[PDB]
Write a protein that binds this DNA or RNA. Sequence first.
RNA 1: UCGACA
DNA 2: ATGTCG
Length: 134
Amino acid sequence: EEIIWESLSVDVGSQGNPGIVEYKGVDTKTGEVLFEREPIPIGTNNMGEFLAIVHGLRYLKERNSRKPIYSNSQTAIKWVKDKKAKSTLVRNEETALIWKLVDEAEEWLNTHTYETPILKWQTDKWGEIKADYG
RNA sequence: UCGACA
DNA sequence: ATGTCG
Ligand SMILES: [Mg+2]
Ligand SMILES: [Mg+2]
């Protein structure tokens, strides 16, 4: 039913899938951009959606913030709950970068605790997530 | 069937 | 329109 305005919204942006991946986190209320990751030459949508949520967890934890995080990605929300990113992306020299980030994010989740609620953004009811690249 | 990314 | 990540 209602939107928690006091929250962080994250989203992935890509050119191709697999292709160039970036992601960002914004204040759900204002759209202020709080963080934006530099483009990764090759990655998948779901790897970027996963990295964006874990980045968000780290970002809120470091700031002593209890805000929830919104993502529109059912996949990535589950990966974070599992502490495991089940991506099909081949491992090679070109995908080394994003696979290192993904392994590091998983290791962060295995070494830290959080109470942050990770919430599904209801695109069908509320329109595009406010972190959308549009 | 559904959630995304193009 | 057609394609890929889940
Ligand atoms: Mg998304
Ligand atoms: Mg989007």
